[PDB]
Structure 1
Amino acid sequence: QREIESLTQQFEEKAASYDKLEKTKNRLQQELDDLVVDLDNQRQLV
């Protein structure tokens, strides 16, 4: 029972950390795409 409780706790903590990472990853992708659009526009201007 101790091992079950420990494993579920570790799984929940890992899942929470994963969820946090996933959100930041998603925003980083959006920022990257928008910066690529900006860079293409600078190339066009030049």
Structure 2
Amino acid sequence: QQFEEKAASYDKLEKTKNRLQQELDDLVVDLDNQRQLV
């Protein structure tokens, strides 16, 4: 019931991990800019 909303809180913690994943996306697009510099 409402405990699945706490599972949704866990999912939102994993969504913050997802935000770290777009941080890694910034990382890889920065390396793409670096290979453009190359």
- Return the TM-score normalized by structure 2: 0.55
Q: Which structure 1 residue ranges, 4+ long, deviate > 6 Å from structure 2? A: none
Larger deviation, residues 15-24 vs 31-40:
15-24
Q: CA deviation at 1:19?
A: 3.3
Q: C-alpha separation between the residues in 1 aligned to 2:4 and 2:25?
A: 32
Q: C-alpha separation between the residues in 1 aligned to 2:9 and 2:32?
A: 35
RMSD of aligned C-alpha atoms?
2.7
Matched positions, count: 38
Q: Deviations over 1:6-25 (max 9, x none)?
A: xxx99469626513422321
Aligned position for 1:6: none
Percent of aligned pairs with the same amino acid? 100
Q: Which structure 1 residue ranges, 5 or more long, are not aligned?
A: 1-8
